[PDB]
Design a protein around this nucleic acid. Sequence first.
RNA 1: UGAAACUGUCCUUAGUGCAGAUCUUGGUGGUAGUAGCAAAUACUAAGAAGAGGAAAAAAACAUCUUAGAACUGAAGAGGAGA
Length: 50
Amino acid sequence: TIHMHAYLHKESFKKRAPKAIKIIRFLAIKTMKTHVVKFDMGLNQFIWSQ
RNA sequence: UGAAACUGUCCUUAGUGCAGAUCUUGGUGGUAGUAGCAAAUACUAAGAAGAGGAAAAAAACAUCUUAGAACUGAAGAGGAGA
């Protein structure tokens, strides 16, 4: 579970959904040690759902 | 270094000697890798093409398709004329 409210606290509104992708990319780099991170289209559609 | 013209002496002649004219023309510095590349709400994911996202996150990647999210809001960022 990624508590993204912690990362997106008081962040500029026009950069909240784009930044959520940047955080999930970074959490995948630090855990699997790979720089080739591919998002499933279902996850991206959920990040932008609101 | 340069490869085809030139020099010394006596007279004659002058478009004859530059540091200045906010001089003329051309070239070039410091400033300085500095000031800046901040109006027009906004982009994201997958795929394709391409030399052109690599990597100890180098956090950003132009074009086209699809999906999401959006703006002009019909006296329009629409469709046409002088």
